[PDB]
């Protein structure tokens, strides 16, 4: 017949962190799609509803945003010491293209949960009640992610009271550890944990300039004239303040070797970031919610693209966690000094717990872990349908 | 336990026309949700991922647009001469509200298909191969919709080569008939099928002013200086042309009693619409595709909000079909006159087949049917999950 029925493909549609994706077990895919290739790419384009000239994904599982135009394959890992191989495809909205070159750290959370819903983890590793350490081989980039997935009654504990910025409703916390994570080069491009940063016409300030997550210039709130508790309204409305921060950011860029000249910074607004830190202090948000000093290890405020950020940027959260873990940095010192392999920092809209491990050898630091918390949940499970001739 | 597992609710996620919705059988809903009420509303808010302050529906089935924030309940009809009752809930994105007062004609297409996937139609009515006449009681507004759903092998024929504007991929055609469809009042507010419309400083033109679908002023292309084949670029770049059309539109508004004064039209830009018609003629689109005169019954071009529309507005498509069916209107005459209970018209980007039936009694016309074609397909089927405490 000219128009056979659609194919039904077992799938699970999950929220993983602040993204949605359609998840497949490798064995559930059509035979032609069980290796990488054009069939697989076509299949996922079609599941998602791409390429779409209307840019709306009305005819597929996509939501017409980068956060909602994603497919994931999990399989039992061939890689020693791992439970699952995790492959992530970013489906272009308007072009026929599936990009396999990246990772989605948000969908990693979903990979750990799905590994268990999918039956891909050795049951010797799954408690009746507790935590399952799901060992994920990120197959796109060749790196390990450990997802500590809570379990009740032998099944993933999905529900709970853990809040994640950008996730409307609270759910159960899944802690992720990115092992040996990888603008490359030295963690401390100046070779020092703290430098005297000269900012022409502004001052000379202590600063930690760190390349971890994202190149970031950190300074002490107090020294640059801030309390560390400031919210967006008291900064983002004063161009004089904002211009001053940019001067510090440019000075650090120069000192970090990210630009050769200060005018080069006009056209390099994304990195480095600029943030200021302080020891903990009670403060209230713009919303009205109180954060007590006892509840946090330090305060951090960061600017992105010339404005104070409302919470914290993802890669900058990694820079904080990394800097906190390395004793002697301004972030470490703000958090109390000594060992700080996990810290909870207060940002304008709430608090965030991050962590890191790092080691030293001939002055030279290596980051061995990035640690963060996210959540995941199943939205729908069953089968996706596509036309059989579409791939 | 403090956080029980999510509930799994049997559901089907379908595209119906140019919308997506989550479809339920009434019997599959939790007991508390099998009558209208707060539980049901909460359930659907939660399935969709509302209310969402981020306006992104990352934590639900919604797509954060009005077209993708919809839930549907079908049940076996209690209403004599009907197969299913069809209830549609529009879920607000940012407020906790489900609106049950409207219909979605696009999701009607999905209602007819789902009625069959859901097993809700008497099998005496379903062929092995042919068409199933699904008789839908639109429970929100109290009206009948007949969906002619194609069937192969005793199952809905979903796939096919029928194109619908706003639907990325072709699928099988489902013809819908809206029985006794219902700015109300007379179909012809002037009492005439054609009037002499005086447009100050522009001219006096034949016009059909019809209230069906939407109040529309129709004129003959030739008389107002157009060929009827014009595309957007040759009109939408000339303010003098656009101002002239608006004068005609205002003249018709006045004559239709929709405004008391011409200045009132400055703040009433949505109705009436203004369109011009012509007998069929070959033309090429901006894309480059040729439409032959033999393939169409007439040409129609409409303006909305002061600009030539790229195809045709939904409610204006109904006005065309209705006017075509009523012998003596300019639309009927453009289409060849006589009986025209279905017509295919050529618009700037393609062609559209619409239909109507109407009857006359003491000069007074009543529309008994609106007929149009759409398509539907299942995107995913199985179960949605929500937290059990969410509703
Ligand atoms: Cl195959
Ligand atoms: Cl496998
Ligand atoms: Cl219940
Ligand atoms: Cl029922
Ligand atoms: Co709770
Ligand atoms: Co085809």
In short:
Chains A, B: Keywords: Isomerase. With 391 residues, chain A is an alpha+beta fold.
Question: Could you please describe the fold and organization of this structure?
Answer:
Chain A is α+β, with helices and mostly antiparallel strands and 391 residues long. Chain A has 2 domains: 2-181 and 371-391, Diaminopimelate Epimerase, Chain A, domain 1; 182-370, Diaminopimelate Epimerase, Chain A, domain 1. The first copy, chain A, has 7 helices and 21 strands. Chain A has helices at 38-48, 105-117, 221-224, 233-236, 239-255, 314-325, 330-334, and strands at residues 6-16, 19-25, 70-76, 84-91, 98-99, 130-138, 143-152, 155-156, 174-179, 195-199, 203-212, 214-220, 273-278, 283-284, 290-291, 298-304, 307-308, 342-347, 350-361, 364-374, 376-387. Chain A has a 19-stranded mixed beta sheet that branches. In chain A, strands 14-15 form a two-stranded antiparallel sheet. The radius of gyration of chain A is 23 Å and the shape is globular. The relative contact order of chain A is 0.15. At the A-B interface, strand 1 and strand 21 of A face strand 1 and strand 21 of B. Residues 26-27, 75-76 of chain B line the site of one chloride ion. The site of one cobalt (II) ion has 2 residues of chain B, from loops. Chains A, B: This is 2-methylaconitate cis-trans isomerase PrpF.
């Amino acid at each position: 017949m000219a128009h056979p029925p659609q194919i039904r493909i077992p799938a699970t549609y999950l929220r993983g962190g602040t993204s949605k994706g359609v998840f497949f077990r490798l064995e559930d895919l059509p035979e032609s799609c069980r290796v990488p290739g054009e069939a697989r790419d076509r299949l996922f384009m079609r599941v998602i509803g791409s390429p779409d000239p209307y840019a709306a994904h009305i005819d597929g599982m996509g939501g017409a945003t980068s956060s909602t135009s994603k497919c994931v394959i999990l399989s039992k890992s061939s890689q020693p010491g791992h439970d699952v191989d995790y492959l992530y495809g970013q489906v272009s909205i308007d072009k026929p293209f599936v990009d396999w070159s990246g990772n989605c750290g948000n969908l990693s959370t979903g990979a750990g949960a799905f590994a268990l819903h999918a039956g891909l983890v050795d049951p010797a590793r799954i408690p009746e009640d507790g935590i399952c350490e799901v060992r994920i081989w990120q197959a796109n980039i060749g790196k390990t992610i450990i997802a500590h997935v809570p379990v009740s009654g032998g099944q993933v504990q999905e529900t709970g009271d853990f809040e994640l910025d950008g996730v409307t409703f609270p759910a159960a916390e899944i802690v992720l550890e990115f092992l040996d994570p990888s603008d490359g080069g030295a963690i401390f491009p100046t070779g020092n944990l703290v430098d005297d940063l000269e900012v022409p016409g502004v001052g000379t300030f202590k600063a930690t300039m760190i390349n971890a997550g994202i190149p970031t210039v950190f300074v002490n709130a107090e020294e640059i004239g801030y309390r560390g508790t400031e919210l967006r309204e008291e900064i983002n409305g004063d161009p004089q303040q904002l211009a001053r921060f940019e001067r510090i950011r440019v000075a650090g860029a120069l000192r970090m070797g990210l630009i050769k000249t200060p005018e080069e910074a006009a056209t390099r607004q994304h990195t480095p970031k600029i943030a200021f830190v302080a020891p903990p202090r009670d403060y209230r948000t713009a919303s009205g919610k109180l954060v007590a000093a006892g509840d946090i290890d330090l305060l951090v405020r960061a600017l992105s693209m010339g404005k104070l950020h409302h919470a914290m940027m993802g890669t900058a959260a990694v820079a904080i966690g990394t800097a906190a873990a390395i004793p002697g940095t301004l972030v470490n010192l703000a958090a109390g000094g000594g060992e700080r392999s996990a810290v909870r920092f207060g940002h304008p809209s709430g608090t965030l717990r991050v962590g890191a491990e790092a080691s030293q050898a001939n002055g030279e630091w290596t980051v061995t872990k990035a640690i963060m918390s996210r959540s995941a949940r199943i939205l729908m499970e069953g089968w996706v349908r596509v036309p059989g001739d579409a791939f």
